[PDB]
């Protein structure tokens, strides 16, 4: 087609395995960094506690509520409250979640991310839905109550990035490898007898030609072709972790061009 090229190896709701060729390592990495840190997500940010009869602390629970993944598909049409014009929050900038739970049962009563209810007007946008990947359809286990154990609270979810808090991290681990045969001599293999026998062969070795000993060292050789795997948490779909990552980095660069323009 044009410049750098992609070749997807495997896909799911949760994973994207692909090959990125005709790219600078610096670019591959900068994208990898952005996916981890700069993609916006919606996550619980304020927790007003009306009642808590639980064995857990108000803030212990509060902390967990932030780590619960929320639907951030249409996150782009929500404003950062900081940029919003209200007094604290509103609809244009937040999602209000409610949680009322009580131990009616003699048996232990469980509190799940499913038990969260949206109270704010969604403006008909795909946002704030607790992500349920759970087979039984419960989502994240927030708490356990016994008998008169009541938990009544209110959550304000806000747009944010992983730089502010890791709760707004839409990506789990991002796998990243290049040159499975150390052709580039980018690592000096620690060994005891044989580095080839001692160090396990990469999966990606199959997608590259072995060096063949009867050849001189390619110094001219440079790093292109990157075997990556992007894992999603739920907030954004796997593809959009890649796309939005590409786009964020693009926007980030545009700001610099624009800054120079104003100067």
């Amino acid at each position: 087609e044009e410049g750098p090229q992609v070749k997807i190896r495997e896909a799911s709701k949760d994973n994207v395995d692909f090959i990125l060729s005709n790219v600078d390592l610096a670019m591959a990495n900068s994208l990898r960094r952005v996916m981890i840190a700069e993609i916006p997500t919606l996550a619980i940010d304020s927790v007003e506690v009306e009642t808590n009869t639980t064995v857990l602390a108000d803030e212990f629970i509060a902390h967990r509520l932030g780590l619960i993944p929320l639907q951030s598909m249409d996150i782009e049409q929500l404003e950062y409250s900081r940029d919003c014009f209200c007094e604290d929050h509103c609809d244009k900038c937040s999602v209000v979640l409610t949680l009322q739970a009580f131990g009616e049962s003699e048996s232990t009563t469980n509190v799940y991310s499913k038990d969260l209810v949206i109270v704010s007007n969604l403006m008909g946008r795909n946002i704030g839905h607790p992500i349920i990947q759970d087979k039984e359809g419960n989502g994240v286990l927030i708490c356990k109550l016994r008998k008169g154990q009541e938990l009544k609270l209110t959550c304000v979810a806000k747009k944010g990035i992983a730089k502010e808090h890791a709760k707004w991290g839409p990506a789990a681990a991002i796998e990243f490898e290049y040159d499975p045969w150390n052709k580039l001599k980018h690592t000096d293999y620690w060994y005891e007898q044989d580095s080839a026998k001692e160090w396990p062969q990469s999966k990606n070795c199959e997608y590259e030609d072995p060096p063949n000993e009867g050849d001189p060292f390619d110094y001219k050789a440079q790093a292109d072709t990157f075997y990556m795997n992007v894992e999603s948490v739920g907030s954004i779909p796997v593809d959009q972790v890649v796309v939005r990552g590409i786009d964020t980095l693009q926007k980030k660069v545009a700001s610099i061009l624009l800054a120079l323009t104003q100067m």
């Binding site: 950062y80 900081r82 940029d83 014009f85 007094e87 545009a254 700001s255 624009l258 323009t261 104003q262």
Partner: protein, 203 residues
Amino acid sequence: GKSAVIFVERATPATLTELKDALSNSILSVRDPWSIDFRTYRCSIKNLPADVSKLMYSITFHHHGRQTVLIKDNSAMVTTAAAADIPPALVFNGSSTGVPESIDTILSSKLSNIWMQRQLIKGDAGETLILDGLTVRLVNLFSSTGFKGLLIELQADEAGEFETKIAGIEGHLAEIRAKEYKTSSDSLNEICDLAYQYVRALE
């Protein structure tokens, strides 16, 4: 005189130029750049009589007098921090010290307990495009949170044909794929309506 303010919510720093070119074949000349500050204050009074806003807007025009118009509950107050704009009689009888400052400085330093600055939008290095009987000003508005949008100021001495002029500019916006924008040409003394229009288009 007449005026209208168009605020392009959905846009990027580039949108300005895109619209700038859709007029390339309508332009005539380009005067000096302009500037503008748009402040939002929130009242801290807690007994505030029902239906009295808690919001007050401050629109500062740069070299439109270094003047600042305060707008609250559909009412406006025009102020100036320019010693050169002081009515001569007020300097003579001592009503004025001859050395004024901005109403915003006063608000933040002497009345800060009653009024708190919530937001500050600034538009620098704006452009003054001169067309046929219609002056069109363009500037990129920025907040403390990066780009905030594009602002179009439409001023026309020609009291007559105007509704057409505004519709025309809105059309060139359709061309550059600038959808989901707000336009105001409302009214409440030129400087006052202009200031009001910014409020309607941004609030």
